[PDB]
Design a protein around this ligand. Structure first.
Ligand SMILES: Cc1ccc(-n2nc(C(C)(C)C)cc2NC(=O)NCCCN2CCOCC2)cc1
Ligand code: NA
Lengths: 267, 334
């Protein structure tokens, strides 16, 4: 079993990196001078997809991709998009996550070739120029990322408690593929910054049950959990699919990216 | 590159630097594979305590640096060394870890008693073992295996608010195999909780006698002489004592090199009697449950903590020195 698996309630994740929604939105106002609320949540979807694409190209497991995504989110939860290029931050987060999750140090040539290939083949709609960064940029960015996170590296995700819930249900084959997919989709939102992973797992499982018309009401009722919180999470999940429907990422992202606040150069 | 200037200079202005906060030049007390360890004083002197600074070997966030930081950032237990602060030095890409300084360790403590030949006091031995087990139980409960337990990695706090408290650490290294479980020596591919327990059994024997129980001269996972020493002490295992020994990758090498009749008169009972530990002692019965050859027949750290040895007079104390004066010399500089 994995290091620190049962320690969430004494973890750095829980004690330092479950943020208050009002604090998150207050810090976001910096960037909302340049971008609408809508455009900001579109950028988050976009960079979630970039990190996923990078992880898939490098053949990393979903949990590594999830950890990299959390690192990215934590950074921009505190800092403006202009502070470090998110194009640099995304592969840096994947690079650090891979080391933390014990898959290893992605080589210089491989990390930079993955960044370059993915942006070219999967995101040419957003990026007409080649990936301009080199490994010295990644290494510098990694130092800033580690500092902002206050060296909080171990991250808990909804996949493990989800698996435990569906096994307990006796419905792993029926429900796990959909519920797992919905957990992936929650990384398009702020949910992982605001709720413990097990609550997110329960919300995703509920939505999977509703989609597959499975009555799990009695099982859900028998849990000892704040259902008001679970319903809050379900509402965000249902909204993320309506947002998905209405969002044309390929048509919109080039213009949204050009509206991002740009860094001050040196004097 | 392409990094916002205001963001950068603000962070630079605020970033605490190890050399500004601590005096450590010429104060190296540890040199090893993982880095350099210095005994440090705070420059801004609101404090006279000793601090340990570790400069991690290499630059950047190696797998080693990343592992140590990730784990120590989460771990919190009185018997596990506690990371106080991480300094990231941008000028040289060096990483520094800050700890409260632990003056003593079991390597030096045992050497002191081995040289004076005063055995280790029996209250102290018990209190040390209890705290070692407490720290490893916490690590094991969190699926953290130590993988290199030995006296040098069992720190003990000196004078101060944690006087006599054990801190499990990992100092690194070239290498002895004296604390390595027999399954490792027969080619076992994976570290386990049982491997840590055997090492604790070894440390316990060494606390009782002042001698490393499986001491061996200097020499693949197969180490003939180390195994020979283990058999000289324990006897050669019967089939029924370790049924899966046949599944060890080096089992046929063992059969080629060894004959059980060589060790007929050998037993842990006999070894410990020679060092004046009675085989009817609760101490001995616990030791024997830790130093079980088959790893699946070793007791766990929790079970060890529940052993009636810890309820027998004298009870283990929080300060392993029992409030008594500490005769052990302070750790010397390298
Ligand atoms: C690559 C690597 C290296 C070490 C660790 N590690 N692991 C541990 C355990 C006990 C939690 C298993 C402790 C450390 N680091 C360490 O003890 N550092 C030395 C502490 C120095 N002492 C502080 C107190 O004063 C004496 C020196 C992890 C990964
Ligand atoms: Na414990």
């Amino acid at each position: 079993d994995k290091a620190m698996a049962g320690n969430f309630w004494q973890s750095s994740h829980y004690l330092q990196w479950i943020l208050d929604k009002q604090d998150l939105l207050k810090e976001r106002q910096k960037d909302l001078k340049f971008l609408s609320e809508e455009e900001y949540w579109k950028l988050q979807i976009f960079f979630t997809n970039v990190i996923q694409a990078l992880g898939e190209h490098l053949k990393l497991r979903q949990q590594v991709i999830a950890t990299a995504t959390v690192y990215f989110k934590r950074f921009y939860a505190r800092y403006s998009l202009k502070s470090i290029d998110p194009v640099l931050m995304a592969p840096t987060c994947v690079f650090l996550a891979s080391k933390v999750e014990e898959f290893g140090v992605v080589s210089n040539t491989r990390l930079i070739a993955a960044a370059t290939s993915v942006l070219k083949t999967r995101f040419s709609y957003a990026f007409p120029k080649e990936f301009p960064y080199r490994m010295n940029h990644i290494l510098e960015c990694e130092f800033y990322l580690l500092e902002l996170m206050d060296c909080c590296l171990i991250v808990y995700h909804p996949y493990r408690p989800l698996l435990q819930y569906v096994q307990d249900m006796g419905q792993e084959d029926m429900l796990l593929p959909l519920a797992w997919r919905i957990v992936n989709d929650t990384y398009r939102t702020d949910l992982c910054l605001l709720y413990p992973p097990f609550m997110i797992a329960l919300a995703c499982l509920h939505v999977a049950c509703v989609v597959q018309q499975k009555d799990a009401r009695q099982w859900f009722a028998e849990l000892s959990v704040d259902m008001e919180k679970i319903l809050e999470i379900i509402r965000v999940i249902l909204k993320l699919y309506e947002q998905w429907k209405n969002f044309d990422e390929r048509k919109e992202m080039a213009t949204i990216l050009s509206k991002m606040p740009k860094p001050k150069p040196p004097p | 590159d392409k990094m916002d200037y205001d963001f950068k200079v603000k962070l630079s202005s605020e970033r605490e630097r190890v050399e500004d906060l601590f005096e450590y030049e010429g104060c190296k007390v540890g040199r090893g594979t993982y880095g350099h360890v210095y005994k440090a004083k705070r420059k801004d002197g609101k404090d006279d305590k000793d601090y340990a600074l570790k400069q991690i070997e290499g630059t950047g966030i190696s797998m080693s640096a990343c592992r140590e930081i990730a784990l120590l950032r989460e771990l919190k237990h009185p018997n596990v060394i506690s990371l106080q602060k991480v300094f990231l030095s941008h000028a040289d890409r060096k990483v520094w870890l800050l700890f409260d300084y632990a003056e003593h360790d079991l390597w030096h403590i045992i050497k002191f008693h081995r040289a004076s030949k005063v055995q280790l006091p029996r209250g102290m031995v018990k209190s040390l073992l209890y705290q070692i087990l407490d720290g490893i139980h916490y690590l094991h409960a969190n699926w953290v295996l130590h993988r290199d337990l030995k006296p040098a990695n069992i720190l003990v706090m000196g004078e101060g608010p944690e006087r006599g408290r054990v801190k499990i650490a990992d100092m690194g290294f070239v290498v002895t195999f004296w604390y390595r479980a027999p399954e490792l020596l027969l080619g076992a591919r994976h570290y386990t909780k049982a491997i840590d327990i055997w090492a604790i059994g070894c440390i316990f024997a060494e606390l009782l006698t002042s001698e490393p129980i499986f001491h061996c001269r200097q020499e693949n996972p197969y180490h003939h002489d180390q195994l020979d020493r283990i058999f000289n002490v324990m006897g050669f295992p019967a089939d029924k004592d370790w049924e899966d020994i046949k599944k060890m990758p080096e089992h046929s090498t063992l059969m080629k090199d060894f004959r059980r009749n060589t060790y007929t008169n050998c037993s842990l009972i006999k070894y410990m009697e020679k060092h004046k530990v009675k085989p009817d002692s609760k101490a001995f019965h616990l030791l024997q449950k830790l130093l079980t050859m088959d790893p699946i027949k070793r007791i766990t750290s929790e079970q060890a903590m529940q052993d009636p040895y810890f309820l027998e007079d004298p009870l283990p104390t929080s300060d392993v020195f029992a409030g008594c004066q500490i005769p052990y010399p302070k750790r010397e500089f390298l």
